[PDB]
Amino acid sequence: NFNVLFSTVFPPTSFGPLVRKIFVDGVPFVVSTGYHFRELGVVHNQDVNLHSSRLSFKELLVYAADPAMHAASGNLLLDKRTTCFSVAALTNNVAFQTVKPGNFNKDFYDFAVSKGFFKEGSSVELKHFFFAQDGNAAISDYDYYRYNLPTMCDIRQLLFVVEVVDKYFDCYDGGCINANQVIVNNLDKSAGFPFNKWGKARLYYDS
């Protein structure tokens, strides 16, 4: 709670991952080794090793998900459409994504009109549709994070509310489980950047 108040004073380029240079068989990388949170302070990793020999499947998986080497090798970006902090541009051009209209099932509509629907003054009418969007739809929707502001709490009131709220959750039981006990519905969904260049979640749960 105190960190939230004190962190509004310091420059916003000082928060985020902290990077370092390591060597993989004599070739230098740039990887994350910590984090500076606005709420939790400075955190340092416990297993960091310069000069490793190879990379397993797991270490490649961890280095590919890191934003360190994606952002350290792109262009600088000054996006003036938002007030949010922009970091880097990962290509040479901007992408403008649209949304399409719906499809009209004319057979059902004709059948329904031959049974007396959609008359003048009826109580049932059409108000649900597929609305279309133009190229500036994604960034204008991302710009709604300007409503998130730093909020400091009444701490002595919160430390009591949390106990009562915890009393609401007493009948359940939890804990950790192993990898052969977890259940996935629909292993045919996306894996999410950069992993959607090579397969779906099935590929990574099988490999």
Binding site: G102, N103, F104, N105, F108, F111, A112, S123, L126
Partner: protein, 102 residues
């Protein structure tokens, strides 16, 4: 519980794929949408029960028009293997009565 009638009718008229604009290819979409619309039959407003009745009539029409294709374009005689339960109200009334079958 019952839904807004405009939601069900809109799910009938507007779709997100061109294949779903032919009814005889799926039919199950309309069976599910008719499950969702059964409790409107008990409403005091008469233009609300007509939605459930319209769905049942459309399901029957689609079944007939699918079966009357295999007898002409081909020479296949389809038998009504108890597919007549879908255009009667008992199959749908059973989903809101307390004795499960999930």
């Amino acid at each position: 519980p019952y839904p807004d009638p405009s939601r069900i009718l809109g799910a009938g008229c507007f779709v997100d794929d061109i294949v779903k604009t032919d009814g005889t290819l799926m039919i199950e979409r309309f069976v599910s949408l008719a499950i969702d619309a059964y409790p409107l039959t008990k409403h005091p407003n008469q233009e609300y029960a007509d939605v459930f009745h319209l769905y049942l009539q459309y399901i029957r029409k689609l079944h007939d028009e699918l079966t009357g294709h295999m007898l002409d374009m081909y020479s296949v005689m389809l038998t009504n293997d108890n597919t007549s339960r879908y255009w009667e109200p008992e199959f749908y009334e059973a989903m809101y009565t307390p004795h499960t079958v999930l």
